[PDB]
Design a binder for this molecule. Structure first.
Ligand SMILES: Cc1c(O)c(CN)c(COP(=O)(O)O)c[n+]1C
Ligand SMILES: Cc1c(O)c(CN)c(COP(=O)(O)O)c[n+]1C
Lengths: 396, 396
């Protein structure tokens, strides 16, 4: 019976969204979005994926079920993207990929797989992290500890406080790393940090879990995988949960992958069978469409060139807006160094605004940002950059 | 670390499939399939859904995320299909639907919702049932008890043994009913049985969970919902997990719904928020494509008429094959009453073959059936009906 079921709390971004769409004043700016937007303020479906969908509409003959792990070409392509085209990981066939419902679905089936097939009980998540990670790991029954990350002062990666809290993590604990475009701070380890982290991870026996949602948004496709690759070269095991939601603009088709690396193929196959069991008891087998679109873009040279170009344009649009944000702020006139905004990667960064300030922003100007001061740079267009900077100036 | 991870067992149908596709003799028949096939032996994508996909390819402008519960028109249409177009359930707005990854995904999020938000610990599943139900409920942490169902003698619904084991079920236990086309026996309660079951369910305080995977395959769309409707009229609460995988032939697009009925809207909304939380921590929000195809077929009269006709042809093809199976058996010549095959609904029935017999069938003739003697009637075509009957005759 359900009469004393407690309502679910407000989830941050979600609530803000309809609070936004209640504001009678169309001068309003929703910087709390979380999805990419172009200079029009729209989230278009990529030309390459439109081409790949006319193609599938022309060529699918059955909608019969995929295998639990999804379409194989999709798996193989996510492994080259992740590990690099000649990776020993791929040649020794130490990695296995399950196509999953989104990068979140990949984290939930890594979560269940691990919860029921191993000794891990703790997952270390950065402070702060994308908030839904916690919920996923706890629904699985694992507990989430947090490690320090952000220097809420220098606006950088507090590497010391990070290895310092990581030292409470024991062997066989999972430490989640964001592979590139750290949500929420857009602050990422440099390759030298990633490498000493790879080294301290094998030292302390950490099980790395890479949450890789924005490959291609920080510097480029390979560059962004350079951290995971520094880890993978040194680890016998690691798990990576990737998403194609932002970077192929396929948010609602739920396209992502959970990759298992194990020491050798014999072990990766035996753990993967239990990862398949976990998927079976969850949604049985994955959605073919968005993944079918990713596998035919990535395996066609014409189409993958057009996609790449569409992704580097996304990536460059966000890089012009971090710069144009810093300039229109340092010209609508206040004192700050917002220069840290230029250093950070991907769509998000903490502007360093207080809740009293972001609330002010929202009531007095109609600029909507998450209570953490996390601003999504892609909701900025050259047209709204000056009302937005004005507003931020006026509340500083 | 994963080196002593135990491999996952063989799942029945799955294993049989590639054992099938290893048989060098193309006279072979796979009756273990589980998906619909036409007279060609193929699982086509429906004309209506092809039309609905050219339409979506023409009209989608964004692949931005759906809400946790999916596309609303889809929810509204599954509720009319389930509860009937003028249901008080819908008018009083006591029902809430979450679009989910398949009917299995609906069972897993009913499972988690219930496991973490209520007092239920036991779920009663028929003996036998579709085997993945157990796994879903256990991954959620609920335990599965079984109630008797099939009379492995008279080839019917042993109604007595059914209410007799159901009496060990306590109040607040979930009893899962298959709404129509009982997998695996194709044996369904008659409306009089459904009604005394509705009555004994409210008597003992059972929480009904309808697994509704084959609406439209037994007699017709409304007829098939008549059991659920006998229950819904009498229950303050019930959950129904439906799938559009067979009946729209959208297996791999993972299209299904989890509907919550509660006493009133205030309560249904508050339990639904926690069902949304469960989805959030699982795959965040559902795949739009297959559901977007179901919502535009169902809301367009031209397209929904073509779909209906395509579903009644599926349904009639399976009904010709149950009859043609019984005749070609009662003419390839052995003694039995296979007449119970005609009484049963949907794609499956237990032929009443022994494991020693289905194994024989498989080694000596290359007819592949599940070890339970469950035969999928849709894998029978008028062309393979006589090798198949011959084989079954020769092993009786
Ligand atoms: C790290 C991570 C983040 O941060 C997000 C979004 N903030 C997602 C979302 O992926 P999706 O494919 O939409 O489920 C996944 N992952 C794995
Ligand atoms: C009762 C039930 C059965 O029996 C099956 C298949 N045997 C399914 C499969 O639905 P899907 O939409 O493919 O996950 C669901 N349900 C809810």
């Amino acid at each position: 019976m359900f009469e004393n079921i407690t309502a679910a709390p407000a989830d941050p971004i979600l609530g803000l969204a309809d609070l936004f769409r209640a504001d009678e004043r169309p001068g309003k700016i929703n910087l709390g979005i979380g999805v990419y937007k172009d200079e029009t303020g729209k989230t278009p479906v990529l030309t390459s994926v439109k081409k790949a969908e006319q193609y599938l509409l022309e060529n699918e003959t059955t909608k019969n079920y995929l295998g639990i792990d999804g379409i194989p070409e999709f798996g193989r392509c996510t492994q080259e993207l992740l590990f690099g085209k000649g990776s020993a990981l791929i040649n020794d066939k130490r990695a296995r990929t399950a196509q999953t419902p989104g990068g979140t679905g990949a984290l939930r089936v890594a979560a269940d797989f691990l919860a029921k097939n191993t000794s891990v009980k703790r997952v270390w998540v950065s402070n702060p992290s994308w908030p839904n990670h916690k919920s996923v790991f706890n629904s699985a029954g694992l507990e989430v500890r947090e490690y320090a990350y952000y220097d809420a002062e220098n606006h950088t990666l507090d590497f010391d406080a990070l290895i310092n809290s990581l030292n409470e993590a024991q062997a066989g604990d999972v430490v989640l790393f964001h592979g590139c475009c750290h949500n929420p701070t857009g602050i990422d380890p440099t390759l030298e940090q990633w490498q000493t982290l790879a080294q301290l991870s094998v030292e302390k026996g950490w099980l790395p879990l890479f949450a890789f949602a924005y490959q291609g948004f920080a510097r480029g496709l390979e560059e962004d995988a350079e951290g995971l690759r520094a880890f993978a070269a040194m680890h016998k095991e690691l798990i990576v949960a990737s998403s194609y939601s932002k970077n192929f603009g396929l948010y609602n088709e739920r396209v992502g992958a959970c990759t298992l690396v194990a020491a050798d193929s014999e072990t990766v196959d035996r753990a993967f069978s239990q990862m398949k069991a976990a998927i079976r008891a969850n949604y049985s087998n994955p959605p073919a469409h968005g993944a079918s679109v990713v596998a035919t873009i990535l395996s066609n040279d014409a189409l993958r060139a057009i996609w790449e170009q569409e992704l580097t344009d996304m990536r460059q649009r966000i890089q012009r807006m971090r710069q144009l944000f810093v300039n229109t702020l340092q010209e609508k006139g206040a004192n700050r160094d917002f220069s840290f905004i230029i250093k950070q990667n991907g769509m998000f960064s903490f502007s360093g605004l207080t809740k009293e300030q972001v609330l002010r922003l929202r009531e007095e100007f109609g600029v909507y940002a998450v209570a953490s001061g996390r601003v999504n740079v892609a909701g900025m267009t050259p047209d709204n950059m000056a009302p937005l900077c004005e507003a931020i100036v006026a509340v500083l």
